[PDB]
Design a protein around this ligand. Structure first.
Ligand SMILES: [Mg+2]
Ligand SMILES: [Mg+2]
Ligand SMILES: [Mg+2]
Ligand SMILES: [Mg+2]
Ligand SMILES: [Mg+2]
Ligand SMILES: [Mg+2]
Ligand SMILES: [Mg+2]
Ligand SMILES: [Mg+2]
Ligand SMILES: [Mg+2]
Ligand SMILES: [Mg+2]
Ligand SMILES: [Mg+2]
Ligand SMILES: [Mg+2]
Ligand SMILES: [Mg+2]
Lengths: 226, 150, 97, 81, 127
RNA sequence: AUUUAUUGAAGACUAACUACUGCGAAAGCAUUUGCCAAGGACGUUUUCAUUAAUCAAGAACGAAAGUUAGGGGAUCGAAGAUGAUCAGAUACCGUCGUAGUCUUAACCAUAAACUAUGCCGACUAGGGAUCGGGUGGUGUUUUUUUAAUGACCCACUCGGCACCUUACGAGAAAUCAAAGUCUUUGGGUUCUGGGGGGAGUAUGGUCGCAAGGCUGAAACUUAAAGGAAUUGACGGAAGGG
């Protein structure tokens, strides 16, 4: 309702979009596209140095628009701005995560949900929490209707998932990790290792979050944007 | 049954009808008797001796190969324990539960299970005292029991 | 008299089942006694579907879904015509329609 | 059925029962003689063993214990004694 | 050739928010709510107030320069209802018909892993 | 302000998976992993040989709320402060909010603590599912195309949480595979009841810091109170015409 305000302040304007400027956002080189869109900051006035306000921005953007295909439509990628040079501001990997509809469609009943997570450090000193999910499946010829695992099977499977994630993330850097997360090779490594314990469909690697970043070291950042 | 639980399972050995056994067995009574007392000299209870005779050697059960039972053979050869085997195992189970309870006081389940274990100990001790294989005034108390285990 | 052999809930061998909250009135109800339904819906509700399909930057687009599991007390489920009162002979039917 | 021979059940129907619920109870287990690779050294092993039975000549372990019947090792030749 | 913001429609009960930001979500363009278009506390969450708010956000985002929007529909969440209010579909269809372009619809309702405590008491909201 | 983004802190909770599924003596128990002891069922041609069933006295545990003394106090919130509704409304509705909610050391010892069905034993009808173990099947599937495995399928069996159909039978009926094998009345054992109030009240003990717990009458009063079904009448209950 427009008129119910008693006092707008206790005590007692010029257009703010002329004062702002555009900036093109660039992806790192482990992505088929670079141009994800545009962002706004103020003009870099004498007090402000608008690049510095514009440093800490995260833009989450779908893997389909980064990679062209539509098979990646349920994964989103967080891109952190990490240096600004002249209108084409340069980002870096900040985290993968799924979409709400994809996870809500996978989790059904009369099957067992199996999760694992590790907190492992990579070769160039980022600290990553990788999450993995998997779901039990029926055999063909199976006539009983639920197909649960026997909760030691789950414990063994979670051990194998944790050891595979830890083995792959040390000895990969982050750019190697993004180029591993794109083709879904971790999912196939898990399914190859766990088929001898229980069937276990839908073996997606869930979100990855950066937890502690190392110091800036600009050469490796400029190594991405060619 | 299962006097300190609600279980009603029926799982036991079903020994055969032949009291003279098994007509593929060629060994003599004295050989399995010396085997029994050899196993007893290295410190094994009658249960473990019977298990070893059943699996490694073919000894269906020692009462039908020899004439008497394994504990009678041990008692006659002079290697009988000071307290019977089931009493000893119940006392060492009790001493493990008490050591855990000293460590973890907030385990009310361990307190309950300890009461059950000591009830079983008193029932066996009353029976063994009434047949005089334990001397009267044999009493289970905890500070003595930690040492009767050795 | 005893109206249902199952006491109006599903609890044979627990003693206690941890409760949930009604989505409609915030009443505490045991999880076995509740009236659980699963509301699966497209987000665009089939009347805006043509306008958004022609307004998309993408062809072939997914038109994604919302998934929700609704937990109802007995009073709110009866009031919202989700379950209703049945005849004495027809209470024993467990099948969905 | 109201007339049946309880003294003479058929062999199939007695084989279907539990070992204690038959007419006279008896074991369904047995003994085997197992020969180990190399030295002849026949040894008799219980069918549900509970122990890692080895031949006296060498550590050539013949069976491993499980919840039921023992699992005989792979190069072994058994006969049901 | 297309420049994107994101749309961020928080359609609860008792009100409906249409709030466009840039792709980073820090820079805001044209946040207009449902209750800013009516004269009553009732119809703040009406579909009509929602379409008027979506229309006026569409106008200001076209005159700023944004052509297409990524839409994030949201309910209150937490320990509250989790279904979207009446103004959601109205606001979505209104900013679809206005001439903006659409892409990548998503639901962002905050779901808890066993949240703290729902209000109302154990007997609920007795009315 | 609300709304958006990036981080951080706090305390609580363990969603979806989650079921006529599991474990526990009950109360109860759902993030991962490590340690510490424990337990049931199964298997068993191991061992002891009646060591057993039930239980006055006595004993361990015992939701929530409550109490005592520290810590912690995010959310919800007895009391309270308030804004509406109303004839009235210190009730239902809204905004806050103390104690509490959490935890450690002590107490308390009650619940529609319910399956309103004590425990142990034997026998009496079928059936299909499922949980745990075992056995059998040249059975499918994975992997070293052949092997064990693991996961499924089929058959059997032991133990469990239950369900469906009959009514041998039982019952006042509702209903019940036990609530049957009870006038054709005796397998073992413990506890409780004897019309409704007065009354779980007085009084005396006894436990407790307290709040209270456990034992527990009588005078007097009354011709019914009650159970399960039936047919009507009504319903601010649901459908149909
Ligand atoms: Mg007993
Ligand atoms: Mg029995
Ligand atoms: Mg009634
Ligand atoms: Mg209860
Ligand atoms: Mg969980
Ligand atoms: Mg389970
Ligand atoms: Mg009040
Ligand atoms: Mg009672
Ligand atoms: Mg009985
Ligand atoms: Mg089975
Ligand atoms: Mg069964
Ligand atoms: Mg069970
Ligand atoms: Mg009546």
């Amino acid at each position: 309702a427009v008129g119910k305000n008693k006092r707008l302040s206790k005590g007692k304007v010029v257009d703010p979009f002329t004062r702002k400027e555009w900036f093109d956002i660039k992806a790192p080189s482990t992505f088929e596209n670079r141009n994800v869109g545009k962002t706004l900051v103020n003009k870099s006035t004498g007090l402000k140095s608008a690049s510095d306000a514009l440093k800490g921005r995260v833009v989450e953007v779908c893997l389909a628009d980064l990679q062209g295909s539509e098979d990646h439509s349920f994964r989103k990628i967080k891109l952190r701005v990490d240096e600004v040079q002249g209108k084409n501001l340069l980002t870096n990997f900040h985290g993968m995560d799924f979409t709400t509809d994809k996870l809500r469609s996978m989790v059904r009943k009369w099957q067992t949900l199996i999760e694992a997570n590790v907190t492992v450090k990579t070769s160039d000193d980022y600290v990553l929490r990788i999450f993995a999910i998997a779901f039990t499946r029926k055999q063909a010829n199976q006539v009983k209707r639920h197909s649960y695992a026997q909760s030691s099977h789950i414990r063994a499977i979670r051990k194998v998932i944790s050891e595979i994630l830890t083995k792959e993330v040390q000895g990969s850097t982050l750019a190697q990790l993004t180029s591993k997360l794109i083709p879904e090779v971790i999912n196939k490594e898990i399914e190859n290792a766990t088929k001898d314990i229980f069937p276990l469909q839908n073996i997606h690697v869930r979100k990855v979050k950066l937890l502690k970043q190392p110091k800036f070291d600009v050469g490796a950042l400029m190594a991405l944007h060619g | 049954g299962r006097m300190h639980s609600a279980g009603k399972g029926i799982s036991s050995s079903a020994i055969p009808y032949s009291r003279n056994a098994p007509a593929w067995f060629k060994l003599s009574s004295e050989s399995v008797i010396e085997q029994i007392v050899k196993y007893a000299r290295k410190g094994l209870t009658p249960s473990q001796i019977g298990v070893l005779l059943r699996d490694a050697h073919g000894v269906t059960q020692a009462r039908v190969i020899t004439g008497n039972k394994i504990m009678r053979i041990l008692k006659s050869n002079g290697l009988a324990p000071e307290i019977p085997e089931d009493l000893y195992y119940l006392i060492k189970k009790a001493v493990s539960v008490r050591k855990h309870l000293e460590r973890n006081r907030k385990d009310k389940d361990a307190k309950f299970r300890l009461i059950l274990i000591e009830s079983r100990i008193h029932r066996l001790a009353r029976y063994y005292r009434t047949v005089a294989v334990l001397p009267p005034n044999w009493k289970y108390e905890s500070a003595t029991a930690s040492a009767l285990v050795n | 008299p005893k109206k249902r052999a199952s006491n109006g809930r599903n609890k044979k061998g627990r003693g206690h089942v941890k409760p949930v909250r009604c989505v409609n009135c915030s009443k505490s109800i045991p999880k076995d006694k509740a009236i659980k339904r699963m509301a699966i819906r497209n987000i665009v509700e089939a009347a805006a579907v043509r306008d958004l399909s022609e307004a998309s930057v993408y062809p072939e687009y997914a038109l994604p879904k919302t998934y929700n599991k609704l937990h109802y007390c007995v009073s709110c489920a009866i009031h919202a015509r989700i379950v209703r009162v049945r005849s004495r002979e027809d209470r024993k039917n467990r099948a969905p329609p | 059925v109201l007339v049946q021979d309880l003294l003479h059940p058929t062999a199939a129907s007695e084989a279907r029962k539990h070992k204690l619920k038959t007419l006279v109870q008896g074991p369904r287990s047995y003994f085997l003689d197992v020969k180990c690779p190399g030295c002849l050294n026949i040894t008799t092993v219980f069918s549900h063993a509970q122990t890692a039975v080895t031949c006296e000549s060498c550590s050539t372990i013949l069976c491993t214990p499980t919840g039921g019947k023992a699992k005989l090792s792979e190069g072994t030749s058994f006969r049901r004694k | 050739s297309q420049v994107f913001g994101v749309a961020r429609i928080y359609a609860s009960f008792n009100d409906t928010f249409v709030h466009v930001t840039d792709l980073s979500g820090k820079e805001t363009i044209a946040r207009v709510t449902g209750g800013m278009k009516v004269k009553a506390d009732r119809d703040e969450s009406s579909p009509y107030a929602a379409m008027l708010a979506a229309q006026d956000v569409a106008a200001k985002c076209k005159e700023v320069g944004i052509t297409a929007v990524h839409v994030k529909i949201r309910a209150t969440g937490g320990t509250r209802t989790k279904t979207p209010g009446p103004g959601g579909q109205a606001a979505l269809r209104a900013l679809a018909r206005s001439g903006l372009r659409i892409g990548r619809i998503e639901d962002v309702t905050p779901v808890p892993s066993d949240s703290t405590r729902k209000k109302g008491g154990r007997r609920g909201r007795r009315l």
